[PDB]
């Protein structure tokens, strides 16, 4: 290669490294747990009430647990964000805006890593809660996870690994078509670079996968819908469950 796509490989390497250091449960660990494996080890499976207890009603602590984890993930993603070259040099206000619109799309992207068609890993991989148990939860909580699984099954079909995902989520943060950005130009120059990095990375890592770059970027449409749909379901849960609390961090991100 030439010394320009060489700078692109170094950026890919930097981002992957930051990704490993920022996120405790990688796709590689998640698949080892889900699949096999002598590396890593067996999850306790929650598929019903008694299994849940072996692990204030249940639909609601399950939702409460999920939202605490969300906040947990926002902290991890925010820590990854800082490592993206150029990010912390941007107008502070735009850093906040990029994160605000970025984190949930990233959350559901990385959530796919922890999912198969049958359920999702929980508690850093020590548990596995089935899709059917989640869906059997009560109106409305019953289908708050379903659009996540639907996306995940289609996304996981791309067979990305962590080194791919690391650049992808960086692309997502550095959008610049985000509402209310002050300096779009500096943001777009960064994303242009990241998109180059992602394109080279996918050609090298998935040579036989045609137009993976285009198909992965199209997935960005699925994410936005999940987020939009989740936000609305949340508005509903708030009004019907007036004793349901939301974390102010998530509320602050949700406001608008």
Taking residues 120 to 159 in sequence order and writing x for each that binds ligand BJB by CB under 6 A, - otherwise, the string is xxxxxx----------------------------------
* In the complex, minimum distance from the CB of residue 218 to ligand BJB, in angstroms, rounded to a whole number: 22
**CB 108, CB 226: distance < 8 Å:** yes
Beta bridge partners of 44: 127
Binds 196: which of ligand BJB, its own copies, none (CB < 5-8 Å by kind): its own copies
Q: Is 114 in the site for ligand BJB (CB under 6 A)?
A: yes
Find where tokens 């985000």 sit: 178
By a kind-dependent CB cut-off of 5 to 8 A, residue 222 interacts, out of ligand BJB, its own copies, none, with its own copies
The residue assigned the tokens 């068609």 is 117
Smallest gap from Cβ 56 to ligand BJB, in A, equals 13
Q: Does the annotation place 14 within a ligand binding site?
A: no
What is the C-alpha to C-alpha distance for residues 251 and 65, in angstroms, rounded to an integer?
Answer: 16
Length of the chain equals 256
| Total Cβ atoms within 10 A of residue 189 | 12
> How distant, in Å, are the alpha carbons of 72, 170, 173 from that of 176?
25, 12, 9
Q: Which is nearer to ligand BJB, 112 or 195 (CB)?
A: 112
Tokens read off for 61: 């602590």
Interacting residues with its own copies (CB under 8 A): 154, 175, 177, 192, 195-196, 199, 210-211, 213-214, 217-218, 220-225, 228
Interacting residues with ligand BJB (CB under 6 A): 25, 62, 65-66, 69-70, 107, 111, 114, 120-125
């Amino acid at each position: 290669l030439n010394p320009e796509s060489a700078d692109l490989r170094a950026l890919a390497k930097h981002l992957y490294d930051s990704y490993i250091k920022s996120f405790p449960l990688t796709k590689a660990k998640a698949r080892a747990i889900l699949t096999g494996k002598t590396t890593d080890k067996s999850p306790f499976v929650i598929y019903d009430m008694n299994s849940l207890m072996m692990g204030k009603e249940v639909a609601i602590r399950i939702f409460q647990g999920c939202q605490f984890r969300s906040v947990e993930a926002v902290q991890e993603i925010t820590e990854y964000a800082k490592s993206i070259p150029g990010f912390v040099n941007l107008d502070l206000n735009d850093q906040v805006t990029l994160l605000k619109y970025g984190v949930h799309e990233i959350i559901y992207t990385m959530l796919a890593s922890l999912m198969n068609k049958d359920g999702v890993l929980i508690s850093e991989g020590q548990g596995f809660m089935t899709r059917e148990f989640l869906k059997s939860l009560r109106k409305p909580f019953g289908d708050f996870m379903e659009p996540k699984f639907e996306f995940a099954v289609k996304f996981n079909a791309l067979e990305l690994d962590d080194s791919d995902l690391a650049i992808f989520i960086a692309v997502i943060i550095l959008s610049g078509d985000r509402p209310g950005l002050l300096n779009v130009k500096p943001i777009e120059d960064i994303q242009d670079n990241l998109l180059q990095a992602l394109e080279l990375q996918l050609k090298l890592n998935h040579p036989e996968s045609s137009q993976l770059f285009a198909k992965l970027l199209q997935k960005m449409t699925d994410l936005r819908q999940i987020v939009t749909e989740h936000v609305q379901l949340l508005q509903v849960i708030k009004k019907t469950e007036t004793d349901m609390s939301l974390h102010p961090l998530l509320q602050e991100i949700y406001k608008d």
